[PDB]
Amino acid sequence: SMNPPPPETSNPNKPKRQTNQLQYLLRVVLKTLWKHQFAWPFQQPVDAVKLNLPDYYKIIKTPMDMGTIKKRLENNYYWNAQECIQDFNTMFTNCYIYNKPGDDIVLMAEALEKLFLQKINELPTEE
Numbered sequence: 511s512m513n514p515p516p517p518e519t520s521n522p523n524k525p526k527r528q529t530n531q532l533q534y535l536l537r538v539v540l541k542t543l544w545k546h547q548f549a550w551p552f553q554q555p556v557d558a559v560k561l562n563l564p565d566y567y568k569i570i571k572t573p574m575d576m577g578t579i580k581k582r583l584e585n586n587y588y589w590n591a592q593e594c595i596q597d598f599n600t601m602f603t604n605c606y607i608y609n610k611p612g613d614d615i616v617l618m619a620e621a622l623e624k625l626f627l628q629k630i631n632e633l634p635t636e637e
C-alpha cells in the first residue's frame with residue numbers, strides 16, 4: 511500500500527501574498543515548533559511504507575506536515591495567514607483522528623499544538 515505524492519508546495523497561478531502575519535507564521539510559529547524535541551515525526555510526509563502502515567493514506571485523505579508548511583512559507587505560497595493556520599490544524603487533527611488516545615505520537619502532537627496555540631494567540635494584527 512503505497513505513499514501518495516506529497517502536498518503541493520509551488521503553484522505560479524495561485525494568488526499569493528507576503529504579509530507580516532505570514533512572516534510571523536514562519537519566523538515564530540514554524541520555527542518554534544520545528545526546533546522542539548518532539549518535532550521530528552512531523553517534519554516531513556509520513557513514509558507509511560517504511561512505518562508499515564498500509565491503511566494510513568487510506569484514512570488520512572488530506573495529509574499535512576511541517577516540512578510541507580515550511581516549504582509553502584519559504585515559497586510565499588499562501589494568500590493569507592488563515593490558509594497556513596489551517597495547514598497546522600489539519601496536521602494536528604489528522605494525528606488525533608488516526609491514532610489512539612494517549613499514544614506517544616498523540617502526546618508529541620499535543621505538546622506542539624499547545625505551543626502553536628500560544629503563538630497564534632499572539633498573532634500580530636495585519637499591517
Ligand SMILES: CN1CCC(c2ccc(Nc3ncc(C(F)(F)F)c(Nc4ccc(Cl)c(NS(=O)(=O)C(C)(C)C)c4)n3)cc2F)CC1
Pocket residue numbers: 550551552555556561563575601605608609614615
Ligand atoms: C507497533 N508499532 C507501533 C508504532 C507504529 C506506529 C503507530 C502509529 C503511527 N502513527 C503516526 N501518526 C501520525 C504521525 C505524524 F506524521 F503526524 F507525526 C506519525 N509520524 C511518525 C513518524 C515517524 C515515526 Cl518513527 C513514528 N513512530 S511513533 O511510534 O509514532 C513515535 C514517534 C516513535 C512515538 C511516527 N505517525 C506511526 C507508527 F510508526 C506502528 C507499529
